[PDB]
Ligand binder design. Structure first.
Ligand code: COA
Ligand code: COA
Ligand code: COA
Ligand code: LPM
Ligand code: LPM
Ligand code: LPM
Lengths: 243, 243, 243
């Protein structure tokens, strides 16, 4: 690939060199390797989380009594786990022959924690088997270890799918990069109150923005529009996971 | 381009290998070849199709009497054909010297059909010359042959532009990949009722989401914002094609 | 990278070759070099510019008396300059070792002018030091020289960041390509009146669409969501630049 020509930047004013951490350098190499290997598409969708949110908020005491804080991440993790089993092509990886998919029968999901040294993506194993307060506790443990440089490489391995949430900061949508060899990543941005047509008038509904990027060699446009459709439906009534 | 390191996926749980069809493998190679050759941009726009939709729906009897079903695809095909003639850089391909564009004086348009064996993109020739019920019938014939593995390579050749519609499944927008050597592709997602400011108050208007990806070597940001602007204007009053 | 197979396009109808200007050819080579070097993400945000717009419009006489026209570009340039100093990683470039960032202590910003011969990106130096009417005048001078082929390469050098505005034509958002070796570019699309929840009811607010693409090796998802968040906050009350 052609390199970028170097520029004498000091010709235009004062410059200062600061170095990158090794974590950043690893980060950079992996993103660029994903970028060039994966033909990326992003499918955008909005989910109605008005009731999910009122559930989250009422279980605040139960959560506090358990010493965990119930955020949105466990509710996303649980729904994505159910879905990674309903639609197994999203839970798989392209075999190195390029002629086979390796379907995984396990669901482990990573989540992006941006730390000062750089990006870490801790993995929660068997997300399909744990409960909202278990996932709540573990997510928080893993993120604290990640921030404290005390996360062991053991916990950064063999994820199936990644959730990347920037909802705590802002934004409307973004296009995340697939964390190859995984085949998809869900970006989540900030929920807003929004007018939604009910057949007669517009009703304010709390809308969550989802941005699914996927590896188009393995997932086609319709499979991906179906994944964000189902996910928006599960987040609108999470009781459907019960059936 | 660096390869992705292979991972022993069975270290994390049970895995199963399923193989890809040859169609998928062709599909995969072409997308990756497009990805690396085309610097992609996507221009998003919403068109007001409230009246186009009420037209579509009233001509339901005429269409049924003709044995065709009038969906939105022919109305998109007709408008894009008019536009591919108004703005000819969208109807062209980069010459292999990289120093010339080959402008095509014919308008043939492909459309994405996702089939079980993989993605096929049948082509309707001289879209500028056929009528809404002719395009309606042909589109449906071609898609059935595509699903039935009875489409001949003859009908997969020499398109100018591609329409990719996921509106029948869901979603808000996506970023399609240019089907090189073509120079643009229109993605169409799901229409929603939306409040639109009329100068005084908001009016519910049925809005269609368009996502134009283009080859930025050949099309610049302003030409592309002008294409989705014109297309949104033609879909708001399709009678302007008459003049 | 595999090449695209050549197609005999004349097999499907009449074709015509028109050649590309040298400007286009330069343009094309740079975009493709950026595409393959930069793992791109785009962060989308909407800023409430209702009051900024009413300011712009009232200062129309002051501006006319000064012989300049006050558009939105100077208000974006000033706010981005303040921000490029608050969040210095956006004002930097990846060193050729790939192990250092070169932080620039100067703020010069380019802006995309699409001209008939192709794309030019004139640079306004020390944007942090000039005032809204100075930036208004200079922006317009530079764009006229650009259109007139009288811009000297001197003025196309050593920018830190690029603004690309298509708001004058239309669109909802797009994904611009980073002008490497810079690390980010702000795309601006068309402002619309929009219902915005105020805690009780929806209020029409004039919303401006921003699309920040960035070099993910150097900028992480959270730094970028923070940049568009701050920028939306500064454009909502530009007096905060005063403090
Ligand atoms: C469990 C944990 C790992 C993730 O939590 P989370 O789901 O991000 O939620 P947080 O509590 O961090 O978010 C902060 C606030 O923004 C809110 N927020 C989160 N997602 C939001 C969304 N998508 N839309 C709008 N607001 C959101 C939270 O509910 C929370 O509100 P509060 O302060 O009133 O409780 C958490 O302990 C943590 O470490 N948080 C830090 C932020 C982070 O790195 N998140 C990464 C998730 S991929
Ligand atoms: C002509 C043909 C090829 C394409 O049809 P189409 O324009 O996709 O429309 P369909 O009838 O398939 O769509 C199914 C339903 O979703 C609706 N729909 C389609 N586009 C929509 C949009 N953009 N927004 C919202 N709803 C939409 C349709 O109008 C239709 O409604 P109905 O069931 O009440 O009639 C059709 O015969 C076919 O094979 N359809 C299958 C779907 C498909 O592969 N489409 C590919 C188009 S690129
Ligand atoms: C200063 C200059 C360089 C840029 O101006 P600008 O900020 O683009 O504004 P313009 O005056 O060109 O825009 C044309 C009209 O669309 C409006 N417009 C601009 N940005 C808009 C936005 N983001 N949303 C909605 N409308 C917008 C303008 O305010 C203007 O309205 P008017 O005709 O009623 O005055 C200008 O002199 C120029 O050369 N303009 C030509 C367009 C151009 O190339 N702009 C490139 C900016 S990166
Ligand atoms: N884990 C890594 O070392 C590479 C970076 C992660 C890939 C995704 S999270 C990028 C999101 S935009
Ligand atoms: N026709 C092919 O064999 C390649 C795949 C099509 C390119 C476009 S439709 C991708 C849309 S996201
Ligand atoms: N300046 C150049 O010669 C290359 C093209 C500019 C890069 C950006 S503005 C592309 C915006 S989508």
């Amino acid at each position: 690939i052609p390199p970028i020509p170097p520029v004498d930047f000091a010709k235009y004013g004062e410059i200062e060199e600061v170095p990158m951490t090794r974590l950043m350098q690893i980060g950079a190499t992996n993103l660029h390797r994903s970028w060039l290997n994966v033909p990326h598409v992003t499918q955008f969708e909005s989910a109605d989380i008005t009731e999910l949110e009122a559930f989250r908020v009422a279980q605040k005491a139960v959560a506090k009594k358990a010493g965990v804080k119930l955020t949105v991440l466990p509710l996303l993790l649980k729904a994505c786990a159910y879905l990674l089993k309903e639609l197994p092509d999203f839970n798989s990886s392209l075999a190195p022959s390029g002629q086979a998919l390796i379907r995984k029968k396990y669901v482990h999901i990573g989540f992006a924690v941006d730390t000062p040294d750089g990006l870490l993506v801790p993995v929660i194993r068997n997300v399909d088997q744990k409960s909202l307060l278990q996932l709540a506790a573990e997510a928080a443990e893993l993120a604290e270890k990640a921030r404290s440089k005390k996360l062991g490489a053991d916990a950064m391995q063999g994820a199936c799918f990644t959730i990347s949430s920037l909802g705590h900061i802002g934004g409307t949508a973004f296009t995340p990069i697939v964390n190859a060899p995984e085949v998809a990543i869900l970006g989540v941005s900030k929920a807003s109150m929004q007018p939604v047509w009910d057949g007669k008038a517009f009703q304010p509904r709390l809308m969550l923005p989802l941005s699914l990027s996927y590896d188009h060699r393995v997932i086609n446009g319709a499979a991906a529009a179906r994944f964000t459709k189902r996910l928006g439906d599960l987040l609108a009534d999470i009781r459907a996971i019960l059936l």
